[PDB]
Design a binder for this molecule. Structure first.
Ligand code: CL
Ligand code: CL
Ligand code: CL
Ligand code: CL
Ligand code: CL
Ligand code: CL
Ligand code: CL
Ligand code: CL
Ligand code: CL
Ligand code: CL
Ligand code: CL
Ligand code: CL
Lengths: 292, 292, 292, 292
């Protein structure tokens, strides 16, 4: 279930920055039709930072309702306060999600023992499988493999989205966890390499605009057909790069609009509409992938 | 008013993580007695991350009440959502605070134009002076001198707490702003250097445990007595270093406890109590400064 | 020929810093007996910096003589002046070496076009296969995959020792070169990962003290036995780490002494004898690998 | 003598990469006429890496002959082998130079104790004042303030060219050395800040094309006229930046040609002629400074 191409889904908004149900329906039908394994709802790519807990809950429950059992949903439940993370966790108990994606606390920079106490306390308040999420570029906190090893001993801590692009982390973590602990890439440009080294999938920004290609690449990689997977990776590499020409998710929301998947690429401040330079880059990348 | 030694005040807590009014009274009395210019209430050092908006308001209001006009109070009002920053800003308008300290959005990594629109929107919803706060190690976002320069043209944006320790930024910023724009260090180990280059004070962690020494150093630096100011700096340099032996504010909360200023050095998860290694380092630094 | 475990051989010295022929004989006999694919003579690990061109020539020629056709020898020929690199290259033409290992110019930081002209000029003054060597931590110069791709089109430039530990570079380079172009790890702690991604061996420091284990790991990796190769990698990981506890080759020269392979671990200034802290770390790593 | 604007002089070359005496005469007459305090001959800016010891000696002795006692000369004597550094040091004993500029060993990355033994051994073989030179971006080795402190106890180790642009090093070093130890900037963009913090001059790339302005800025800074010095610094800041648009000394040699100070901007491989983009940047910077 937590293998293959998992999309970190955009939260589509109207002109006013309010969630657009018509666009969210189009996105979810697209993922159902194009082999996406699961949807991560309100991760970083889904603008977790600018949605209230109430709006956050509403987006996850709308995603579940529109999925209609056709595709599993994972709830973004990260917070930099343990109390707040437990609150989000309890909100999604018996919601219908299959698990939670929970980021390392950002801004306050806990110690590794702080990370252990944070995720242990969260895991205690749910039966839902927990996927840890390390992205030190954004958080200022790097959860080291030793800490991942310690947390992997807790029953419902089942995996990690490793977003560093540091490919030595795959076997550094595998050495300290059981064989069924799930390793997922959170870095699109190194996802293929990550899976070649033994990772079992990607939680992907690229999947938003290249669902079929990402699903195919992950299937081929998991089957050990690395040459065939890499030919797809090379078609997608301009997207893997240029979807971060401006901070995620500014480029990918314009990408979704360019493909007619969303009505508008509106984001909530402080995130801003894509620049002309950014738009030109994403256009070229989409064309290279044969999608425009 | 925004000059000299400004303390980034700890939020003292009991064993259960509730704010300790008895300890907060002792802290405020200590700053009034020892020459501190102003108090920043609920900044990074004040555990802004793990307080609710409601608890955040209560700590600022309790700080104003106990200060009783004896020392000015600046509200921490930072948020990574523009709507949330505006709501925090409105909560403190007409409260009695003299200004706001507002950090660059963390985790979501806006563009420089995003930072411009963020702080512009905040400045438009207040009468209060706004001090920008740049700490990319924690936020993943570096507000560049060019952007500070653009924001300095907005009426209510009056200065910046520059915490990078990049001392080139003093004159890179001064070159782009009026002589009236306030430059304050947010990096204790380079605060003396920052003032010698033309900065007009420090928003200080070290001031929590060495208020008199920091007030004297800033006074002598502003008076051009660099030799005398630097002799105090050398007495404090072990504190400037070792108060970050673990992530701020883990060490400084233990330091306040060791000096009898707070009853407990309890923090809120995910922040954790100081390690034995940390305790020994802070003990040695306090003794070096002649404070234990 | 340029596959498997290739040792970056130490230049053994007596107490006066003169090359020890008795120790060099023991080292070469050890590599022949323990499956090493080839010897790099006077690379970084061989103290290229502190040997004269004349002493450099003598060490390579003595290595060829003692090898006596039993194991191929690659000459270190790197220099930060193109004229000097050509002169070194000419010194080893018709010597009996099978190829040259030529580092990116250090200290003077040429452009990518400068690197192109440097290695093009060297390649034009030789019949010998050339292995590029990229180690920006030491040189201040990072040869990018694009530049490797341009150089790979020159007849005598046959591969690269990529020492960054950036595992993304395996397929970034492979994408721009023929299947014949040789990719070798120059980073011992990521060498196993590098081979699993499609690298065909390692130019190794660890091979100096664990020749049999490194030969077995590279053989199993090239055969696709990743699980068995990784079990050897885990036995060696303390060596892969602790052989850089002080700058290479300070630790590995002590390691060779501890195993009886050299009489003294003397280096030439400015390189210094291992510290007690370093000696203890290398002792513990050798014992972990079952070699003491 | 080792105060004010010291030029790190370019080594002017004809089309063949041979030293041009006519151009070297023009350069030295220019520095004599425009207030330059001293000439550093065959530093990094003088292409130390691509000149043989013989050619190196010839450039320093030609610089002395053309100076004709009108301006002091400091010899570049750095090498990454202690033996080689002693050889260069002995070459300039009783040459007529007033001192030596000696860089931290590059590429081989000695320990701090290695740096101490290197510079101690060099200082023993001369009566000439030695100026240490820290530029870790180029060398891969960072000489820390504690090491500078230890070396400052040796009689003829008299100062340091600190090229990091880390302005906290000024008082970190001053705290550990006597008041007469000489601190010079090796980073043009932070030279003014460095002198404001107590540095006594610059060993400058910018001085090659803006000798009069750099001499004036250093005189005003040393006299405590910081506002007047900074107005000159702002006129020069495009040069301080764009003279590193490509690695030094590629831009500054074109700059010297553009001002008619040298016949050609030829460099020795692997250094390359300035790109069109580079030329446009240096042109704009020279115009901003009012020099074209
Ligand atoms: Cl909800
Ligand atoms: Cl990251
Ligand atoms: Cl990597
Ligand atoms: Cl690929
Ligand atoms: Cl910072
Ligand atoms: Cl100081
Ligand atoms: Cl490297
Ligand atoms: Cl492994
Ligand atoms: Cl000479
Ligand atoms: Cl540097
Ligand atoms: Cl700095
Ligand atoms: Cl300035």
């Amino acid at each position: 279930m937590f293998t293959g191409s998992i999309v970190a889904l955009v939260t589509p908004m109207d002109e006013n920055g309010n969630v657009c149900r018509t666009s969210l329906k189009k996105l979810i039908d697209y993922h159902v039709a194009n082999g996406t394994s699961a949807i991560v709802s309100v991760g970083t790519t889904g603008e977790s930072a600018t949605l209230s807990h109430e709006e956050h809950g509403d987006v996850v429950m709308m995603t579940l309702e529109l999925a209609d059992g056709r595709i599993p949903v994972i709830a973004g439940t990260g917070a930099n306060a343990t109390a707040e993370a437990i609150s989000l966790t309890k909100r999604f108990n018996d919601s219908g999600v299959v698990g939670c994606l929970t980021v390392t606390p950002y801004y306050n920079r806990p110690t590794q023992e702080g990370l252990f106490q944070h995720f242990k306390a969260i895991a205690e308040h749910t039966d839902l499988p927990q996927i840890l999420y390390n992205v030190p570029s954004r958080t200022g906190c790097d959860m080291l493999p030793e800490t991942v090893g310690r947390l992997a001993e807790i029953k419902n801590i089942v995996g990690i989205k490793e977003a560093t692009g540091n490919l030595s982390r795959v076997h550094q973590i595998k050495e300290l966890v059981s064989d069924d602990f799930i390793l997922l890439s959170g870095d699109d440009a190194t996802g293929m390499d990550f899976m070649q080294l033994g990772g079992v999938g990607v939680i992907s920004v690229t999947a938003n605009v290249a669902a079929r290609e990402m699903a195919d690449m992950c299937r081929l990689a998991l089957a050990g057909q690395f040459a065939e997977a890499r030919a797809i990776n090379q078609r997608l590499m301009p997207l893997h790069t240029k979807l971060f020409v401006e901070p995620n998710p500014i480029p990918v929301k314009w990408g979704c609009k360019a493909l007619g998947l969303v009505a508008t690429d509106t984001l909530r401040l402080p995130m801003t509409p894509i620049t002309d330079h950014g738009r030109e880059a994403v256009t070229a990348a989409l064309k290279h992938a044969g999608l425009l």
